[PDB]
Design brief:
13 strands, homodimer, Diamond Light Source, Thrombin, subunit H, viral protein, 23% helix, six-stranded mixed sheet, 8 helices, alpha+beta, binds the ligand Cc1noc(COc2cc(Cl)cc(CC(=O)Nc3cnccc3C)c2)n1, 3C-like proteinase nsp5 (chains A, B), 3 domains
Amino acid sequence: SGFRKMAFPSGKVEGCMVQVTCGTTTLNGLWLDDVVYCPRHVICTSEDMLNPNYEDLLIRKSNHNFLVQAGNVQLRVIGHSMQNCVLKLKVDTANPKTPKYKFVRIQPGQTFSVLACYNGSPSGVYQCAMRPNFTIKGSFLNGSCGSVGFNIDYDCVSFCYMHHMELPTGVHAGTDLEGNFYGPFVDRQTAQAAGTDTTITVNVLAWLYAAVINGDRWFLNRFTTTLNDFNLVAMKYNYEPLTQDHVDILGPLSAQTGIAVLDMCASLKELLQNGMNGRTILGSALLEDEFTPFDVVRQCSGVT
Amino acid sequence: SGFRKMAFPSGKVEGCMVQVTCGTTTLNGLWLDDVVYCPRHVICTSEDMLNPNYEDLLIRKSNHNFLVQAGNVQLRVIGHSMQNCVLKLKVDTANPKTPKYKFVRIQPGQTFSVLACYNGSPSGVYQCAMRPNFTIKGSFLNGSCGSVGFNIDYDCVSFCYMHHMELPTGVHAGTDLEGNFYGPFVDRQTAQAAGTDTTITVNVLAWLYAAVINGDRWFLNRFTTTLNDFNLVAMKYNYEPLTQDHVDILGPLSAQTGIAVLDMCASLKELLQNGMNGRTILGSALLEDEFTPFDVVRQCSGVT
Ligand SMILES: Cc1noc(COc2cc(Cl)cc(CC(=O)Nc3cnccc3C)c2)n1
Ligand SMILES: Cc1noc(COc2cc(Cl)cc(CC(=O)Nc3cnccc3C)c2)n1
């Protein structure tokens, strides 16, 4: 028993982290096969971040202008290209530590582990969710750009995120591994609206199931509700509407606990309308939404 | 900016995880140099866990009775010994992936990363603290025994904890890497009192400094306090007494924010006496105590 924000083991990703320097700028790169991926703002100086013409800036760069360092050995760059907001540096050496990998674009509400890096060196690993407004609430500093988010399916690492930017609001924005930003963000020093962020209802419900599995049952009641009645409560509290797909996704957790999804929704409804009244659920005084039903099943079953 | 419960990169520890089988029982082992470390209750059956005579049970075992598997290759056991509550299986092959390591006994209030494992395979990594009552609030299942806790100082992994047991209260107990249990716990199926657990005051204060560094300043006030006045509030709320050593340990965070420790204590005093009033600090509705002043400095500075 016990329930924590558990990140994936980071080993397979640590072996892919390199350092990328372009002029004055140094950020992290991802070395997979003979290709290093990194945010394209590596070619920029502070002066041209207001409105950079990336194609024009890339033109003034050559293969030899991109310094790629793998721990201590210098990688030779034989190619460079821009794919959306990422630069792809073809190096003459395939990464001997390249794991089985995929590049996937995660859906908002899904979770992933982040290996925060500085100068191609990992500093820590934490679990987080792609918020419904496509921002992430991570922990990043100057130099963290190029740090990646991923998931692991047995031996296959699915790379989903590359950190590019901190917005003035303190939230983090980035791209998938093809360079497409999650959300409406642009890689330039300009005013950018993050958008209204709602709570991932299916994740809060899954975490309520984790609480029941882990002994915390104070919030369970003698009531039930309907999808349409629950959704009226969800709208008032800026919660994502619960669909039948979400109910089905919560099926394994419903079967494991013997608590119907709509009975759990009535517990959530009471918790939303009345609060915790000073009590805790799994050591938390607020409703947690960064655990998918999949994360709950995995953690409570012990999937390696 | 941003602040998360960040675990250490787990790679160096993943390369040390092996599977240990003794009869019907299978748990995790730690392979460092030519020695595999694992909880000694691996030699037990469910029938003798009520009051096991470990010396007597170990006598009925020979080197060939201990099955050590490193991923897929069988390790040959040429020695076995019991050191307190851990068994030390001398294998004929040194671990090629042995990192620079130390065995340390952490102090209560200190934090460490746990690589939760099942069948010698890592499933996840999370950060936690040794509670003042020497229990840990981790996430462990049947088979997780042998999972280790550690810290990393540049290239050196300091092993501090080995998971042995879940208590009926849901908390977790274990040993240092010499087999000495943290706390008054014994490795036997018997009634065991965890003891009153207090809040790590120096950690809550350090996390209040992380909040100020990360923009959350609503809780800062026009007041100050003394060590003796603050401690009267700490006792009433089951908080660890704050000493001058703790004030000194918070020195770097005091200098970085320009907020004197005793001014921060008066903010904590008001928060304890009045609560959050429905507000959050770093996304939390309760006072977090599993971040040492060291963890805060490391995360807010970007130490790799
Ligand atoms: C100086 C300067 N030059 O440009 C800027 C602002 O515009 C940008 C635009 C882009 Cl695409 C990227 C960046 C890097 C960044 O945001 N890093 C970062 C990430 N996560 C946490 C903290 C930090 C500092 C800055 N200031
Ligand atoms: C069956 C059975 N045999 O003994 C016992 C109870 O006594 C013990 C005594 C010891 Cl020293 C160790 C264990 C293993 C254990 O506690 N595992 C564990 C760890 N963390 C989370 C979940 C689990 C299940 C059981 N039941």
